[model samples]
Target: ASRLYTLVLVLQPQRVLLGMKKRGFGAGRWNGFGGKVQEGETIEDGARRELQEESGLTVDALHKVGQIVFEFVGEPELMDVHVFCTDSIQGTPVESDEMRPCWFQLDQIPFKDMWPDDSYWFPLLLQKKKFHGYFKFQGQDTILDYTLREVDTV
Candidate 1:
């Protein structure tokens, strides 16, 4: 079975907000802010909730930018992640126990410190292109293979 997840990217003029996971599934890496979509909440609502909970920021709207499926070797379950982008935010990002928020210039995004699959799709996100991707990983750091494509809709 596949589990649902959300990932929200906050974009400013020339920088983007990212979070360092404090301790959990993605701890020690800089990535977007979000987590599992909880029951009873719409998927977009879940994305908003998770973003606020982890980064102390809120957005009036979110643009769906991409969808990704992650498969880890030997793991029976898959992670289906919905990716969103928001340039308009209501609060300054504040760190929570789950994440520490920080901004990085567009040219300086720390992909090496993020999920390996990010480098494959982030270019599409920056281009404001909708996309779909699949990644098969041997472990946390090694991407055995992947496929990515731009799409009319995610």
Candidate 2:
């Protein structure tokens, strides 16, 4: 099975905003706020809703930056996640039942606390480039093999 999801990054001039997942998938890690795309909603719509629901902020426009396919070995399902980024946002992020928002300076991203594949693709995000990535994970903590490339559109 393949599940569709979304992930978003909120960017400022020198900082990036992330949310600490309080529960559900990705719990205990600092990550971009987003989740499953519900039935009858566009993936973009789900991205907007997830960001707002988890972080108490809303993005009017999200730039589609990348998309990744993640295959976890021994798991029955794979994840096809669309990634978005935006500097434009409404309201300051506040803690929610799903996430606690936090900001990190560009140089201070905590990769050790995020999904292993994040470190590989995040640099492309910081570079403001579009990309496509495929990752095979041995477990949640280890990426056994991965391929990432800059692309014209994702």
Candidate 3:
């Protein structure tokens, strides 16, 4: 079975907000803000909660952009990541114990310091396309295989 997770990206006119994970699974990597969804909350609520908790930013609405399933080699559990993006936010991003927030211009995204899978689907996000993807990874840095495609709806 797969565990559900959320990933929120704040996309502005020319820049995007990302966080440097301070600890846990993705420590030291730049990524979108989010985590596991809580049982009592809606998926979108969970996404907003995680984004606020991790980056101190709040949004009124989120656009569903993509869905991705990640499988790590030798690990039985799959991560079902629901991706969302918003063009506007309510507060300044503040650094938290979990993540340090930063903005990167579209042309200056530090992909070299992000997950390998990010490069594959981020363009679709930039173009405002809905997509679904599956990635098999040997570890955090190596993707053994993946399938990605645009979809009418996520």
Candidate 4:
């Protein structure tokens, strides 16, 4: 399966974190810090790198559950989005030109400011249950959204 990385950061329930994006394309969209895999970086390494790049914070460990796919606008990519949740990390979330690191609580999530697919699977992560999902979307609307529930791997 192809690979992508996302970090499930946990702060106080209402803490806000940075998820800054650039101004072009999907810019101004504040979401978790990650992107497409690099040529040589392993998935774990890529996650760490992206975490540091976008939030300026490096996590000590990442509990990889599995992967889910989201086909949005773009090139109809088959992405395996790696979901991870962690409470232990280091460094302060700094504001870079690309993103400004901040924190948000679970209930305080600016859901409207994020990609529409986030609402589909994000709640699952908050419930502390591991899951893998496949979401198919056409442009801005979801055509199909499915999931493989009961994932408990770390």
Candidate 5:
């Protein structure tokens, strides 16, 4: 069975907030704030918790922007991540022990520093389109194959 995870992007009109993961799973990568979903919490609730833990910002509402299935070629587990986006946030962003937050202009996203799967569906988010993606990776950067499609709703 796949493990569930959540990822939230704090978006504004022409900017987005991304965090450099400090340690554990995907460390050294710049990505959205999120982690594994717990048993008692809803996906959005977990996303909210991780967002706050990684970057001191709290989101009031998150729009479901994408869904992705990430599989590592030699691993038995699959990561089913729900991706969300929101411009509504409370509190100023502060770096946490788990992450270092940074804002980037819409055209200046640090894609090279992010997960390989991000490039597949990230552009759809900026386009205000919903998406579904599946990626198979040999490791962190080598993508074996992938599929991404725009959706009417996530």
Candidate 6:
């Protein structure tokens, strides 16, 4: 509850980077543009690095969305997920070694290739709504549970 950090990186606000699975991760699979945070980096910096690493996109302003940490009782570790949002960006997204950068119809995402939890809040992201989520699952099967704490603005 007290060890959570937040990182938010806006999805270019327009050019959403979808993907095409080449082999792994996004080997012609369409998904959001992101990756894990590296060590010794601020959440913002990590977000920036992840965004760039996954989609080769640059970010403008980062708005702090929120943070949530989940204790994976079924597993041996905890998850510290940071949240952030970016409103501006630059450069075009190309296929990276680990991900395929492309764009898709927000209403019709390739859910089959993504984590089931993505279906929960990705749409809200498209609407520019702030969202906070957590889960403990493995192989599409929820090992623990799905949790969300969002502040509705409407």
Estimate the TM-score of every prediction: 0.97, 0.95, 0.97, 0.81, 0.96, 0.71
What RMSD does each model have against the real structure?
A: 0.9, 1.1, 0.8, 2.7, 1.0, 4.0
* Per-residue alpha-carbon lDDT of candidate 5 for residues 6-120, written as tens digits (9 for 90 to 100): 9999999989999888889889988888889999999989999988887888789889899999999878989999999999999998977877889999999998899977877
Highest-TM-score candidate: 3
TM-score, model 4 to reference: 0.81
Q: Give the local distance difference test score of model 2.
A: 0.90
Better of 3 and 4 by TM-score: 3
- Residue-pair clashes per candidate: 0, 0, 0, 13, 0, 20
Question: What is candidate 1's lDDT per residue for 1-154, written digit by digit as tens?
Answer: 9999999999877999999988878889998978899989888999999888888887998999999999999999999999999998998989777778889999999998998888889888898899999999998999999999999978
lDDT of 4 by residue, 58-127 (tens): 7887766557776664654577777665667788778767765567766778777777777766777666
- Estimate every model's Cα lDDT from 0 to 1: 0.91, 0.90, 0.93, 0.67, 0.89, 0.60
Higher-lDDT candidate among 3 and 6?
3
Q: Tens digits of per-residue lDDT for model 6 on 16-68?
A: 55665466543455555444565676767777776776667777776656454
* Stretches of model 6 off by over 4 angstroms after superposition: 1-15, 20-29, 66-73, 152-154
- Candidate 1 stretches with Cα past 4 Å from truth are none
The 10-residue segment with the lowest total lDDT in model 3: 50-59
Query: Which sections of candidate 3 miss by over 4 Å?
Result: none
lDDT of 6 at 133: 71
| TM-score: model 5 vs. ground truth | 0.96
Candidate 3 lDDT, 69-135, residue by residue in tens: 9999899989999999999799999987878889999999899999999999999999989999999
- Reference-based lDDT, residue 118, model 6: 60
